[PDB]
Enzyme design. Structure first.
Site, mmCIF file in Angstrom:
data_model
loop_
_atom_site.group_PDB
_atom_site.id
_atom_site.type_symbol
_atom_site.label_atom_id
_atom_site.label_comp_id
_atom_site.label_asym_id
_atom_site.label_seq_id
_atom_site.Cartn_x
_atom_site.Cartn_y
_atom_site.Cartn_z
ATOM 1 N N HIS A 1 -36.111 1.297 -33.075
ATOM 2 C CA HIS A 1 -34.729 0.507 -33.022
ATOM 3 C C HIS A 1 -34.083 1.170 -34.327
ATOM 4 C CE1 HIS A 1 -36.630 -2.901 -35.744
ATOM 5 N NE2 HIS A 1 -35.390 -2.858 -36.211
ATOM 6 N N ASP B 1 -42.472 0.150 -30.517
ATOM 7 C CA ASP B 1 -41.369 0.242 -31.524
ATOM 8 C C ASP B 1 -41.695 1.211 -32.498
ATOM 9 O OD1 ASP B 1 -38.758 -0.123 -32.799
ATOM 10 O OD2 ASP B 1 -39.172 -2.258 -33.448
ATOM 11 N N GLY C 1 -33.075 -5.371 -42.530
ATOM 12 C CA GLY C 1 -32.871 -4.344 -43.837
ATOM 13 C C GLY C 1 -34.316 -3.996 -44.070
ATOM 14 N N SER D 1 -36.691 -3.350 -41.404
ATOM 15 C CA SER D 1 -36.886 -2.923 -40.265
ATOM 16 C C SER D 1 -37.467 -1.476 -40.525
ATOM 17 C CB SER D 1 -35.864 -2.696 -39.280
ATOM 18 O OG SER D 1 -35.449 -4.051 -38.746
ATOM 19 N N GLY D 2 -38.444 -1.066 -39.916
ATOM 20 C CA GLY D 2 -38.981 0.312 -40.090
ATOM 21 C C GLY D 2 -40.074 0.552 -41.109
HETATM 22 N N1 120 Z 1 -38.356 -12.214 -39.432
HETATM 23 C C1 120 Z 1 -38.643 -10.837 -39.309
HETATM 24 N N2 120 Z 1 -39.727 -10.261 -39.808
HETATM 25 C C2 120 Z 1 -37.692 -10.012 -39.013
HETATM 26 C C3 120 Z 1 -38.183 -8.505 -39.357
HETATM 27 C C4 120 Z 1 -36.987 -7.574 -39.245
HETATM 28 C C5 120 Z 1 -35.916 -7.647 -38.461
HETATM 29 N N3 120 Z 1 -34.774 -7.162 -37.891
HETATM 30 C C6 120 Z 1 -34.107 -8.092 -37.553
HETATM 31 C C7 120 Z 1 -32.856 -7.464 -37.035
HETATM 32 C C8 120 Z 1 -31.680 -8.283 -36.818
HETATM 33 C C9 120 Z 1 -30.607 -8.006 -36.406
HETATM 34 C C10 120 Z 1 -30.250 -6.574 -36.165
HETATM 35 N N4 120 Z 1 -31.184 -5.836 -36.638
HETATM 36 C C11 120 Z 1 -32.391 -6.126 -36.995
HETATM 37 O O1 120 Z 1 -33.365 -5.353 -37.090
HETATM 38 N N5 120 Z 1 -34.350 -9.377 -37.658
HETATM 39 C C12 120 Z 1 -35.478 -9.221 -38.154
HETATM 40 C C13 120 Z 1 -36.683 -10.160 -38.518
HETATM 41 MG MG MG Z 2 -38.747 -1.530 -45.363
#
Ligand code: 120
Ligand code: MG
Ligand code: CA
Length: 223
Positions: free
Chosen positions: A40, A84, A175, A177-178
């Site tokens: 994503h 993902d 932020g 993510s990944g």
């Molecule tokens: N609670 C978590 N562990 C989490 C982790 C990554 C996320 N990434 C996102 C996300 C929200 C909106 C747009 N893009 C995203 O990756 N929500 C997230 C929530």
């Molecule tokens: Mg990271």
């Protein structure tokens, strides 16, 4: 990362920041020419930034390398976020040193209860927005699949696992993510999704990397 701590400069040497004019996702260095991140986080025009601590200041240990190709998993589903994971090849090999190192891929999957290290430059507030400039860390255990599935009914597949605290307070967030989830020295997860951040009974969901080792190894050797 919410409820975590400042890692310290270059203490997570395999952590990378994907930048498309600003930081938008994390990733992990698996060898001098490849990075693994979340599907994503796919974008065209990615520059991989290695050896980072403050992402807004050039402190001397960074390597900025453009990606030559990106490969999203053949079965990635953007609607459910199943599979993902994506691989990014660097245009030039990175120079590995104490500040830039790769992380090992797992030989087996980790057990519920194993403690892992999650890191990233994502939001640090559950309710609010505060984006840090230095890398934040969080130690969190892998949760049982039963607690993961009860929190997200009909949304967890065998390619996902939950890690965190059901009480809330500590979690990865947008932020992050990944980025990497490292347990016992192996890359076991990728920050994928969750419901808000650090909410009670809403732990983070991570891509289960042990299920993709053969695909990763085969794909990097043929590209
Ligand atoms: N609670 C978590 N562990 C989490 C982790 C990554 C996320 N990434 C996102 C996300 C929200 C909106 C747009 N893009 C995203 O990756 N929500 C997230 C929530
Ligand atoms: Mg990271
Ligand atoms: Ca920097």
């Amino acid at each position: 990362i919410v409820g975590g701590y400042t890692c310290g400069a270059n203490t997570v040497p395999y952590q990378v920041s994907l930048n498309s004019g600003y930081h938008f996702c994390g990733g992990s260095l698996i060898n001098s020419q490849w990075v693994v991140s979340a599907a994503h986080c796919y974008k065209s025009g990615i520059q991989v930034r290695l050896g980072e601590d403050n992402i807004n200041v050039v402190e001397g240990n960074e390597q900025f390398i453009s990606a030559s190709k990106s490969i999203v998993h053949p079965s990635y589903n953007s609607n459910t976020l199943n599979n993902d994971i994506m691989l990014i090849k660097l245009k030039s090999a990175a120079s590995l040193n104490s500040r830039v190192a790769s992380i090992s891929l797992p030989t087996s999957c980790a057990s519920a209860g194993t403690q892992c290290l999650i890191s990233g430059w994502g939001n640090t507030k559950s309710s609010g927005t505060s984006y840090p400039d230095v890398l934040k860390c969080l130690k969190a255990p892998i949760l049982s699949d039963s607690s993961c599935k009860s929190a997200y009914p009909g949304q967890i597949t065998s390619n996902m696992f939950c890690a965190g605290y059901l009480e809330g307070g500590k979690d990865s967030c947008q932020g992050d993510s990944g980025g990497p989830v490292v347990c016992s020295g192996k890359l076991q997860g990728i920050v994928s999704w969750g419901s808000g951040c650090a909410q009670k009974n809403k732990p983070g969901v991570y891509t289960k990397v042990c299920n993709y080792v053969s695909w990763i190894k085969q794909t990097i050797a043929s590209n």
